[PDB]
Design a protein around this ligand. Sequence first.
Ligand SMILES: NC(=O)C1=CN([C@@H]2O[C@H](COP(=O)(O)OP(=O)(O)OC[C@H]3O[C@@H](n4cnc5c(N)ncnc54)[C@H](O)[C@@H]3O)[C@@H](O)[C@H]2O)C=CC1
Ligand SMILES: NC(=O)C1=CN([C@@H]2O[C@H](COP(=O)(O)OP(=O)(O)OC[C@H]3O[C@@H](n4cnc5c(N)ncnc54)[C@H](O)[C@@H]3O)[C@@H](O)[C@H]2O)C=CC1
Ligand SMILES: NC(=O)C1=CN([C@@H]2O[C@H](COP(=O)(O)OP(=O)(O)OC[C@H]3O[C@@H](n4cnc5c(N)ncnc54)[C@H](O)[C@@H]3O)[C@@H](O)[C@H]2O)C=CC1
Ligand SMILES: NC(=O)C1=CN([C@@H]2O[C@H](COP(=O)(O)OP(=O)(O)OC[C@H]3O[C@@H](n4cnc5c(N)ncnc54)[C@H](O)[C@@H]3O)[C@@H](O)[C@H]2O)C=CC1
Ligand SMILES: O[C@H]1[C@H](O)[C@@H](O)[C@H](O)[C@@H](O)[C@H]1O
Lengths: 339, 339, 339, 339
Amino acid sequence: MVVKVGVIGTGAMGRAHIDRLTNVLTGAEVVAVTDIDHEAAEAAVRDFHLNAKVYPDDTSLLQDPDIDAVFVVSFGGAHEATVLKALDTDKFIFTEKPLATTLEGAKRIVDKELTKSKKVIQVGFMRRYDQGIRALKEKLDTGIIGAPLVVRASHINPNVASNYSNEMAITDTLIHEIDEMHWLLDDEYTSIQITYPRQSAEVRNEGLHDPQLATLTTKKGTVIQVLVHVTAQYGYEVKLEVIGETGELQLPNYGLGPILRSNANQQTAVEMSWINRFIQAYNTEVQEFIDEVAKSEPPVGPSAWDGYIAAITAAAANRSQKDQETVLINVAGTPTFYQ
Amino acid sequence: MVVKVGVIGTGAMGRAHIDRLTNVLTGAEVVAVTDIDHEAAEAAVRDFHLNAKVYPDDTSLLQDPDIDAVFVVSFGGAHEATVLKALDTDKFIFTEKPLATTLEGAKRIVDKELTKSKKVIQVGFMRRYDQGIRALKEKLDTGIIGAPLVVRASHINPNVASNYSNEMAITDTLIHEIDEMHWLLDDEYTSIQITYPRQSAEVRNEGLHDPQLATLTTKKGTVIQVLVHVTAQYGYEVKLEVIGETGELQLPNYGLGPILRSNANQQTAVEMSWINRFIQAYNTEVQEFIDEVAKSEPPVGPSAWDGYIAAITAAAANRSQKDQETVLINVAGTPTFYQ
Amino acid sequence: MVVKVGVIGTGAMGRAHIDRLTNVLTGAEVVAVTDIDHEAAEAAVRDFHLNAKVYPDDTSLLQDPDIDAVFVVSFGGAHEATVLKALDTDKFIFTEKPLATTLEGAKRIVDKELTKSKKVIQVGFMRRYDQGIRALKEKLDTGIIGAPLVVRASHINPNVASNYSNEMAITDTLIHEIDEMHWLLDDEYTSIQITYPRQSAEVRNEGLHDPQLATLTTKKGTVIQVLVHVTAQYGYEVKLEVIGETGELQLPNYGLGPILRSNANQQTAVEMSWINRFIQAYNTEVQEFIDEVAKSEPPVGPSAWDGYIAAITAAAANRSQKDQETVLINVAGTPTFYQ
Amino acid sequence: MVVKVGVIGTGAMGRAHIDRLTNVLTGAEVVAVTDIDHEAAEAAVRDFHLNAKVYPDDTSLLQDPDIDAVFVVSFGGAHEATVLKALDTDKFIFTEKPLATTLEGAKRIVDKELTKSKKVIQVGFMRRYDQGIRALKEKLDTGIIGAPLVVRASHINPNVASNYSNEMAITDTLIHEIDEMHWLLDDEYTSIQITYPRQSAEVRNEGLHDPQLATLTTKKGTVIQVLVHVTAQYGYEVKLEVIGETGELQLPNYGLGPILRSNANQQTAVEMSWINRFIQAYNTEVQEFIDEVAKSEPPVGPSAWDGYIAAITAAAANRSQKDQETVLINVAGTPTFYQ
Ligand SMILES: NC(=O)C1=CN([C@@H]2O[C@H](COP(=O)(O)OP(=O)(O)OC[C@H]3O[C@@H](n4cnc5c(N)ncnc54)[C@H](O)[C@@H]3O)[C@@H](O)[C@H]2O)C=CC1
Ligand SMILES: NC(=O)C1=CN([C@@H]2O[C@H](COP(=O)(O)OP(=O)(O)OC[C@H]3O[C@@H](n4cnc5c(N)ncnc54)[C@H](O)[C@@H]3O)[C@@H](O)[C@H]2O)C=CC1
Ligand SMILES: NC(=O)C1=CN([C@@H]2O[C@H](COP(=O)(O)OP(=O)(O)OC[C@H]3O[C@@H](n4cnc5c(N)ncnc54)[C@H](O)[C@@H]3O)[C@@H](O)[C@H]2O)C=CC1
Ligand SMILES: NC(=O)C1=CN([C@@H]2O[C@H](COP(=O)(O)OP(=O)(O)OC[C@H]3O[C@@H](n4cnc5c(N)ncnc54)[C@H](O)[C@@H]3O)[C@@H](O)[C@H]2O)C=CC1
Ligand SMILES: O[C@H]1[C@H](O)[C@@H](O)[C@H](O)[C@@H](O)[C@H]1O
């Protein structure tokens, strides 16, 4: 039966999710929208030819009994309150990352969800759905390279908007690696440290350090070195290498485009848009959510607990940014509810 | 509104299309099925949880007024009669390849379709929807390597079933390149020639020559060299290189799986299944057809005319297979109906 | 002993051989040069800091008793007369390919050398010395991919000089593959056919067809498909793929230059000339020649017989060029002198 | 005229250099040897068919006026004393790494040589001569990727002998990166920090931590992250990536061996031997030294100053190994003598 969806926040990613649900994926319909910019919400309805009602706020939308699930796609800082409101209903909840912008907010959500008769929140950490990354994890898990010793990763982005701040290097960019690595390794973090190499001349934003180097450590002692470089110019790229005791695994170059021999070079295109890079993962993640809601079963994707882990680690990273010193992480054990 | 589909032939590929239409793609519903094996048809209904009627044959299914489009997914030899029957209705028609198993059957279909007010047939030549192959064509069409002079291609398959005949090297295997190349090059074929290199010791089928080399010439003068190797053992692989005046284009490695460094080698997995190789293409191809039907517009994918070109070329190749001599091809000018 | 060398022809490759003999290789000194362009000869002496005599012609240089060995590095069509003259002396002879530009010329050389007390000619078929190509042959010979069924090869040049003729597409270019494949496969040819794809707009030489396709068949039934493309623009490249019963072997991309990520592309440099692509092969073959001369022993590298065997096939291809028809080949057995 | 060489220390690398001078390269002759193991010295002369005198010690060898240059290939701890002695002569000096085993020893050599009328010492840091590494440096120096911000490198080795110590991870292994980076970047080091990920189960040596992570900083702010992994099992590999403001540069795939398609995989061999990996670099380095001596000009390769830089940095790294703390490095501005 069709999953009736309400969307809270009809901006860039909200519209992208509306588009997915309407024109790409199967088994859902958007029947309600709201945005603090009412005209934006109206436009979403028009642009996507929805049979949907526009509500003036989240509270009103959440009162609609016909809605089976809500998508929270507002500003990050608005997620916490909205998710908490939604938990007063029986509706399933897909929230874009972050779960909340503070670790305390995340904890509030976890604590509230724990009181319920079903897990209902999935968080939009799409990396876990990317076919390439999953294939690497699968291969790692065969034991073929032994224990993971070091992970080297890159998060490369061409340029940023004028409103992109230093802290967003963590909260908008590194956050993906923050969620991914503990999942990839089936391990828990023990520390994070952010260091600043020489400042790029390409940076146009006051206070923004770029590139940034992030070193994370895990309980088993695996060290993760992430390069974050958001004014890299050349392209958008995600790189991942796992160094094991007996071998290595790395993600192949992304892209299906041809190899060009021309002008004394052999070349392949590099993606310029994060949007295109993770199109598959976004579709897969959302389809999975919808498929679960259709069965009235709890989501199986990243949970509020994953959101909490991410928020704790992001907080630690933002602390590290202040003086470039290592910050310890010690997350509580995973409640059975979230296993 | 949803496109209501009837499926004629509920075998391996018929079920795969049903699965696509039901569980993967958007905007369609299978409401009717038929198969000469009635038990298979019934199973398809149960297996995919369809709300669908099982009909004794194609004729009866075709009388169902609720059906917007039919999928013809029976034995190749059955396609012609069914497509001709379907053309007595107003319904849209997706037929799997081949359009017909004979040249004359293909023309009968074309002649019949030409009598209609709009085009309704799409033929399942999915290569055109493969992202890698499409990306190559697109790059070619930028002019960046100048005019295409030579095409070198491979269709590699690990092993064949006992029913695989010499002529199937053309009709089941090369057929894909036959449809693909004239599209790739915006050109028309003038001849085809099949040669037999030394016979592989891996061949276990009566009368099968393997490998086979196919050489096609085009009106603009491009020479196409295809290696067909169906007992290759190592994997399933589709390779494509275009040699231009000022450069070359080739398909990259297919696969998202990781690069493994282990035991004095660096390695990546090779696909063993054509099914897996073309999952995406099948999805894109069918979604497009459904999207067209939903708008009541003619299909924009490979047409009955393309089916005809394929059939003519395949026939010529089968003739060449008899003595390894060149066989001329002179395809009629495209009717405006198919422009 | 330091081998005293004379060089006949001091153009691009003459200079390159002088360079290697003077600065890289051991046990040789260039003591004499000649070129029909006196200024070119003088430039070679100057540019490579030689204490060398500049002779007005080959005959005078050949009559200098102090010269131990001569290198024939003139225009291909000039090799025959020079080699024949040199055979009137007791000097060792390294000639670049081709041995001659006609079958009759090659035969004249063989007939003359057979009258001598020992073998003195080495032909510059350097492909056999290339580490990559050798490594491929070695792997093939392990049986890991079973019997070789088809070979696909490319011989790519960016452009040609004004003196490059249609006939030279065979005698200067394809001649490498002619020698290479029979060595690689330990097989002999039964036929050759040259075909002319769509003529490139990049051709600037009257009478030159480019690209050209060569199909060679061997006694064991292996079919070799060579692409000759000498106005390719993009670079200089040699490609080799062997299709076996149970697998494939391919030469990797050549180059040590870096991978550049820049401007929405990932790219690596392509060689623009043989001079660098085959520097190792040239070094090895020439050092081997010099080492034999130093011991007053016959060369162990490719012989005038190899040159003649190649010339037979080359002449067959030149015949095929006229009408694009297949030409049969059946070479004589190797004389004892050349075993 | 031929460069007459004396070799001090005729062990593994000593014999390798003798072989280079005797068989591989042009313009030199080994005319004297010495080793504390007088039988090793005798074996060298014998095995390589040398016309050389065996001297009882370095002092006696250095007094031989016919010797143009000496190679110091004894135990590392024995270089300092031997070098300082040779500096009492006018002979050119090629010393293997290290220049000295202490920065104090290195400083003494630097001070002594600085009193001489011209530079005579080259240190055997062969990385700088590796074609790929040089090609990358050169591309970097074009400015095409802007300023270097981060360098990521790997020094991967399959296994170690029973005598390999924790300190050797620096002195024998990382030392190559230690010399290479400041040269690559034309910059000076300001700090080094060694950190230990989880210990590999493959380690069989008391006290050896593997892998190790080395972080170096430069004056311009470039951060260098090196992974040292000496029990990696899979192969020997050197990886290098430079992250620039506007792009990236990395070393390409190393290897000439074929690509094998077999058994559901595509694979290429990985080098297992550091010896084989850097064969070319060793040859080029020594040939350049000989060429300089031949012209009676100072060496142009890595100098005593470079050896001093390496010694300081290695000492700092050995210190950091104790507690994983960052150790500052302050190298004096280069004397013009060494520019
Ligand atoms: N998982 C991923 O890779 C990505 C996640 N996101 C997340 O999606 C969320 C939205 O980002 P964008 O769409 O790019 O930003 P956006 O700025 O384009 O849109 C946000 C929308 O939310 C509306 N809004 C703000 N506060 C609201 C509230 N309290 N209630 C209702 N509506 C409100 C705004 O008016 C705006 O239309 C963010 O949390 C972002 O981090 C965004 C892009 C990629
Ligand atoms: N485009 C592509 O890549 C592919 C195309 N195909 C095409 O799909 C068609 C079906 O192939 P598969 O599903 O693999 O074969 P299959 O043998 O598994 O299924 C064929 C089904 O058709 C039924 N059938 C036969 N004659 C019929 C008729 N007159 N009316 C109704 N049903 C009839 C059979 O009972 C069977 O259930 C073939 O034409 C094949 O060439 C199949 C696979 C891939
Ligand atoms: N093995 C290989 O990969 C290569 C082989 N070659 C061969 O080397 C030879 C020379 O080629 P390039 O140096 O590239 O050509 P080039 O055109 O640069 O030089 C040819 C030189 O020969 C001189 N010459 C012509 N006729 C002469 C004669 N009768 N006596 C003396 N000198 C004469 C010309 O004046 C010119 O200086 C050819 O046989 C060519 O096929 C050339 C390049 C690569
Ligand atoms: N640049 C590179 O990649 C490499 C550098 N090396 C360096 O080469 C040097 C020698 O290494 P190996 O040959 O591997 O060691 P090895 O132990 O095989 O040989 C050293 C030889 O020196 C002799 N010896 C020791 N002290 C001596 C003294 N005071 N005077 C004369 N002879 C003496 C020993 O008896 C022995 O025969 C070391 O400094 C090593 O670090 C070695 C291998 C590679
Ligand atoms: O003489 C050169 C030489 O034979 C090269 O190796 C070949 O690549 C060029 O085509 C030819 O003109």
